[PDB]
Amino acid sequence: PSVSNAYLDDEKTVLAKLSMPMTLADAASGFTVIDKTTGEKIPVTSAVSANPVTAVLVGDLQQALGAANNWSPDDDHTLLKKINPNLYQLSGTLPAGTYQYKIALDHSWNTSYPGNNVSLTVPEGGEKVTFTYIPSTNQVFDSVNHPNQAFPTSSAGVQTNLVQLTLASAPDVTHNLDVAADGYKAHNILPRNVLNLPRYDYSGNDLGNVYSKDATSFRVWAPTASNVQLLLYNSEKGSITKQLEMQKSDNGTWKLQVSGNLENWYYLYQVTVNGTTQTAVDPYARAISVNATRGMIVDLKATDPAGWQGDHEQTPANPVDEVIYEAHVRDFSIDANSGMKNKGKYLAFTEHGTKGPDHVKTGIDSLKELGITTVQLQPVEEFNSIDETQPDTYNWGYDPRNYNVPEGAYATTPEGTARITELKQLIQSLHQQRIGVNMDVVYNHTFDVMVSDFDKIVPQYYYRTDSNGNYTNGSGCGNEFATEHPMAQKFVLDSVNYWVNEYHVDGFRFDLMALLGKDTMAKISNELHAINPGIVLYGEPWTGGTSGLSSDQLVTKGQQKGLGIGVFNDNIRNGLDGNVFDKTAQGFATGDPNQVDVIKNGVIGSIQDFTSAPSETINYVTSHDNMTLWDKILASNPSDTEADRIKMDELAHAVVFTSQGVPFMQGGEEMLRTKGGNDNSYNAGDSVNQFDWSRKAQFKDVFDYFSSMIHLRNQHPAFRMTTADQIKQNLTFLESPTNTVAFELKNYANHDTWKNIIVMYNPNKTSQTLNLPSGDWTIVGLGDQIGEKSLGHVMGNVQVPAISTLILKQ
Numbered sequence: 001p002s003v004s005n006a007y008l009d010d011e012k013t014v015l016a017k018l019s020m021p022m023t024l025a026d027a028a029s030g031f032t033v034i035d036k037t038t039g040e041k042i043p044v045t046s047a048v049s050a051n052p053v054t055a056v057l058v059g060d061l062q063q064a065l066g067a068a069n070n071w072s073p074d075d076d077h078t079l080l081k082k083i084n085p086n087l088y089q090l091s092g093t094l095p096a097g098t099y100q101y102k103i104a105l106d107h108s109w110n111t112s113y114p115g116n117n118v119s120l121t122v123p124e125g126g127e128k129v130t131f132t133y134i135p136s137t138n139q140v141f142d143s144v145n146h147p148n149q150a151f152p153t154s155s156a157g158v159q160t161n162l163v164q165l166t167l168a169s170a171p172d173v174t175h176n177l178d179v180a181a182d183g184y185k186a187h188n189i190l191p192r193n194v195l196n197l198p199r200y201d202y203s204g205n206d207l208g209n210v211y212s213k214d215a216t217s218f219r220v221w222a223p224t225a226s227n228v229q230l231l232l233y234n235s236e237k238g239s240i241t242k243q244l245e246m247q248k249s250d251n252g253t254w255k256l257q258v259s260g261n262l263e264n265w266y267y268l269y270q271v272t273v274n275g276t277t278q279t280a281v282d283p284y285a286r287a288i289s290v291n292a293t294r295g296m297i298v299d300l301k302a303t304d305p306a307g308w309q310g311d312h313e314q315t316p317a318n319p320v321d322e323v324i325y326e327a328h329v330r331d332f333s334i335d336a337n338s339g340m341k342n343k344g345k346y347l348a349f350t351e352h353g354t355k356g357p358d359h360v361k362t363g364i365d366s367l368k369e370l371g372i373t374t375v376q377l378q379p380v381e382e383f384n385s386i387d388e389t390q391p392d393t394y395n396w397g398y399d400p401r402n403y404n405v406p407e408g409a410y411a412t413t414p415e416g417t418a419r420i421t422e423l424k425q426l427i428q429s430l431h432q433q434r435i436g437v438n439m440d441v442v443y444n445h446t447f448d449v450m451v452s453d454f455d456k457i458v459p460q461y462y463y464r465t466d467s468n469g470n471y472t473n474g475s476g477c478g479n480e481f482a483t484e485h486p487m488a489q490k491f492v493l494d495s496v497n498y499w500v501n502e503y504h505v506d507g508f509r510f511d512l513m514a515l516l517g518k519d520t521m522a523k524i525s526n527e528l529h530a531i532n533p534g535i536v537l538y539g540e541p542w543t544g545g546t547s548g549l550s551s552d553q554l555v556t557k558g559q560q561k562g563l564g565i566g567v568f569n570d571n572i573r574n575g576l577d578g579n580v581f582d583k584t585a586q587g588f589a590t591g592d593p594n595q596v597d598v599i600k601n602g603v604i605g606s607i608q609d610f611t612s613a614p615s616e617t618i619n620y621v622t623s624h625d626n627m628t629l630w631d632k633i634l635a636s637n638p639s640d641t642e643a644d645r646i647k648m649d650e651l652a653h654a655v656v657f658t659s660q661g662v663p664f665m666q667g668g669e670e671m672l673r674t675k676g677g678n679d680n681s682y683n684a685g686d687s688v689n690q691f692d693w694s695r696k697a698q699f700k701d702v703f704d705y706f707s708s709m710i711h712l713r714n715q716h717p718a719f720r721m722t723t724a725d726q727i728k729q730n731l732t733f734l735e736s737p738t739n740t741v742a743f744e745l746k747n748y749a750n751h752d753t754w755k756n757i758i759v760m761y762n763p764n765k766t767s768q769t770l771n772l773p774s775g776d777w778t779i780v781g782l783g784d785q786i787g788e789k790s791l792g793h794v795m796g797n798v799q800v801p802a803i804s805t806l807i808l809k810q
Helices: 329-333 346-350 363-370 418-432 453-457 486-503 518-531 570-577 596-603 629-636 642-658 694-698 700-715 724-730
Strands: 003-010 013-023 031-035 044-049 055-059 081-084 087-094 097-105 112-122 127-134 139-142 159-167 177-181 184-188 208-211 215-221 227-233 242-245 253-259 266-272 277-280 324-327 374-377 381-383 400-406 436-441 507-510 536-539 566-568 617-619 662-666 731-733 741-745 757-762 768-771 777-782 797-800 804-809
Touching: 003 177, 003 184, 013 177, 013 184, 031 044, 031 159, 055 112, 097 127, 097 139, 112 127, 112 139, 215 266, 227 253, 242 253, 266 453, 277 453, 324 329, 329 346, 346 363, 346 418, 363 418, 363 700, 400 418, 400 486, 418 436, 418 486, 436 486, 486 518, 518 536, 570 596, 570 629, 570 642, 596 642, 596 741, 629 642, 642 662, 642 700, 642 757, 642 804, 694 700, 724 731, 757 768, 777 797, 797 804
Parallel strands: 324 374, 324 662, 374 436, 436 507, 507 536, 536 566, 566 617, 617 662
Antiparallel strands: 003 013, 013 159, 031 177, 044 159, 055 097, 081 087, 087 127, 097 112, 127 139, 177 184, 208 215, 215 253, 227 242, 227 266, 266 277, 381 400, 731 741, 741 757, 757 804, 768 797, 777 804
16 A cells, blocks of 8 residues: 655645545644755645546536536536635526526546535526536535535545645755655655756756867756766766866856866766756757767767858748658668668768669759759657667668767768758758758657656656656657756757757758647747748647647647648648548549538648648648558559559649649659558668669659649749738639639739640549630640640630649630
């Protein structure tokens, strides 16, 4: 029989879990707290149940109290409010008459009180009535039937296995604190939400190491530590060179200035918390030993490549001006046929004039040819899954370990600062070609807990835990980062600022962004847009498991409104090729006849679905997750010809490229990249994941079609309206045949040089006709030909070939 967990969640509040329930008594209810460091006893002044109570007044009085319907237990319009932990009340004014009521719990009729319906007569003229529910006894009162009934201010009687304790004094968060109750084995009290308080909130910009020729200063946040020492090493693998005591400083930080030139030195923090001492790599380290056994102190200036002072950012006026191309650094160039020398490395992106099979352009020259504006790199923040001494193992990188360090496996060497210079050279190279770089970042969880630097410095606090003391599984990977904790939020904010400032990155794709929370994303957006309003920010509006964060804060679709961030649009994705759960499901592009309305909603940049502005939707059909489109269409359309499947693939992407919003594509779709049907290729290796550049030679017509669509969008801002009002003003759907979508962009929309543009998607296996508005129309997109030039003129009516997109202009 034990207290199984205990948290200090406020200066004088402990949340304790018991291995079996108890009935609470007066005051302390048998609970004791001792500071085992000083021997001092701290009196428990109050003990209440921490379990929430959802008690709703139900009956035929519910409408009269503002509810939509009577007898409705799930209508929180008449939810009772907490007066004290053992007193819940609701007041409201009722018109004269006879009523009936109960109190229903937990939004159902499973449990309601009392035994029977209660009769209530409201006298002439009406009356304000108070309704009361007492958790300890399940008693239900109203102020008419029981005018001055007495209400308790004790939780005695309440049965619970989860208790909230109030303490007489605030314990020292660095001390060994214990809680016990009569008949229950004692447990340590771990500081948790107490650390949220302003006294433990450090707002300086100097966490980590700050290097100069004359001295390096170190600062780490460790508010519960009894001691922190700095361990300095003058070699990557050799024994400790110098061990130094750090000094307790502001708001739970420890600091130290070390005189001398520490360039290329290595270090660790040695942190003593309560009953144990461990070493940790600085979460703010900018470089590491091989495999991050140690942090490395470096001169960042010396890492800049030549010409870096001339580098210019690639951030357009609005996110709808980007065409985003997702690529993994290894996949891009690892194939023997890639024509790039630095195979699987950052530096492959610096190579001009590279050629593949049958003289196709590869590498950056291929990106240039294709017309995409922005490369989204799969994770390049240091992750755990690749041993840097074996840098050719394969991983996507969704297991981050050192957030402020470039992944070593993609550098020519993991030694020292080559990884910094080479990633900067990648970014520099792309910028020289007017291509931006968005980083896929994984702030929502770490590779593991307990052995993580976070848990070795401030036990559990960087992660979400439940009332049992277990790590919650928001990411699906065993843990989730607690952005509702101010210093954890600060860690993320400092990190994204560092990547923009030091590496000149142009934006971020937030893995499982819903988990980061609205308040956090608003702050990220505000801070980064203050640096550069053109920075583009977006991410996945879903989780990977049940999250500890309240649903009101999760950034699901609709929650991004007005924040200056976008969400991946799984509605248009499912509409294009079928629900993600069913491999054989068809969608609009591939034969399903029931998706027209979904597609129309995507065409208008989702402004009637979940966005306030078209910049808030990232439109797409595939990504690194699940199947490539070529593989997906083989699964859903196995009986269709190669030629028709090519048309379907092109059509799905044509919708993405011609819809209002932010178009995104999985890199390699323009050459029908195949994973051999793999639907989760995170560690599957190069035969599965690589860019096989022979497929660009094989499917050059497909590549050219994609390029022609992308260049058309780049040239025509009517496709890239920036507000909902512009879209409502300028975009009209035209009457068209069953299972087709046709629209017109009017009025030289958004400063287009074409007065009217018509687009029609025809997914059907026969040609379809469209009635045209008045005047002469110039065909610019017909069948396999898309461009700026006249393909012929028509009036009145026009035929759209099977499985294709028609584009006309006037």
